[PDB]
Design a protein around this ligand. Structure first.
Ligand SMILES: CCn1nc(C)cc1C(=O)Nc1nc2cc(C(N)=O)cc(OC)c2n1C/C=C/Cn1c(NC(=O)c2cc(C)nn2CC)nc2cc(C(N)=O)cc(OC)c21
Lengths: 172, 159
């Protein structure tokens, strides 16, 4: 329905269209001049986490102990994008720029506030339609699809393995 | 109906609920070491310019109010004299409604933009009426001779 439609368009206009054109250059700059020489290159593309239950925690490292914060990307009013290391059996298995799609926090809060007239069933339906609309916007957005990946997932699960699966899919 | 609903809720959850509880203390700190309340400009035609001072010469930037949130303090001039001073800013979700009316893929008409701008104001007013936020902010809705400085001064004198 139209709630998800407006949120996906807002997320694109007010944020993704402003950060994705220069993201590739920032990632290259970090790999060439800031990344520790004993580390693997940070993967290209912004990985956007889309929990379908709209459960967006405040700390990304507290959600999963295998997602460890590493550094902030060189800055692009201003935007702070974080680089995370994904651990598998203690070893570093991948490194990427990761963050939650914040409009799903709004969908969660709307399902909690009575005045919003928004059910928990409406939340799940609108979360899926938010992902659909955002995927359609990014499919034809100039310099945005090849610079980001949408990670949609449902929970009853390892969030670190969910991100690693998408990273290995791009490599294969 | 629902585009405006989602934007008003997003503006509250992702921004106003995080800045309005501590705004009164930041305003007091500036005065001790500018009127209370955040004045949110809501142009119903969704014409949000990038520079506030360029929109009206009688609205002059004075200083920034000390996640990082930067709010700007402005002086409102009347016949050259300083007639009021307040923390002022545009409701940025109206810039999204304007852009949606411009992008073909959004399937959003200019008529849909005016309807959704009014419903955004209505939903935001209802949220703020019962948010634990109302006494720390005021909504200035207007349709653009028109003077934006006089529009803000009218609300300041009403309080
Ligand atoms: C608007 C795009 N959007 N739409 C949906 C749906 C979700 C998002 C979204 O995810 N936005 C987003 N993510 C970011 C991540 C980073 C990063 N990685 O560091 C940096 C960012 O920009 C600084 C990010 N932004 C931009 C805005 C962030 C919050 N914010 C707002 N927000 C709104 O007005 C608004 C309008 C509607 C509708 N909903 N909201 C609430 C979000 N006004 C602010 C004013 C000031 C100030 N006074 O200086 C400071 C702010 O926050 C520091 C302000």
């Amino acid at each position: 329905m139209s709630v998800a439609h407006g949120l996906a368009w807002s997320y694109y206009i007010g944020y993704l269209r402003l950060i994705l054109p220069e993201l590739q250059a920032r990632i290259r700059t970090y790999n060439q001049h800031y990344n520790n020489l004993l580390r693997g290159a940070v993967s290209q593309r912004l990985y956007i986490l889309l929990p379908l239950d709209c459960g967006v925690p405040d700390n990304l490292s507290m959600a999963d102990p295998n997602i460890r914060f590493l550094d902030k990307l060189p800055q692009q009013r201003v935007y702070s994008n974080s680089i995370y290391e994904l651990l598998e059996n203690g070893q570093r298995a991948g490194t990427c720029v990761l963050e939650y799609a914040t409009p799903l926090q709004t969908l969660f809060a709307m399902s909690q506030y009575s005045q919003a007239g928004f059910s928990r069933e409406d939340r799940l339906e609108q979360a899926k339609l938010f992902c659909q609309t955002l995927e359609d916007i990014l499919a034809d957005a100039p310099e945005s699809q090849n610079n980001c990946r949408l990670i949609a997932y449902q929970e009853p699960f390892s969030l670190s393995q969910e991100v690693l699966r998408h990273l290995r899919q791009e490599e294969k």
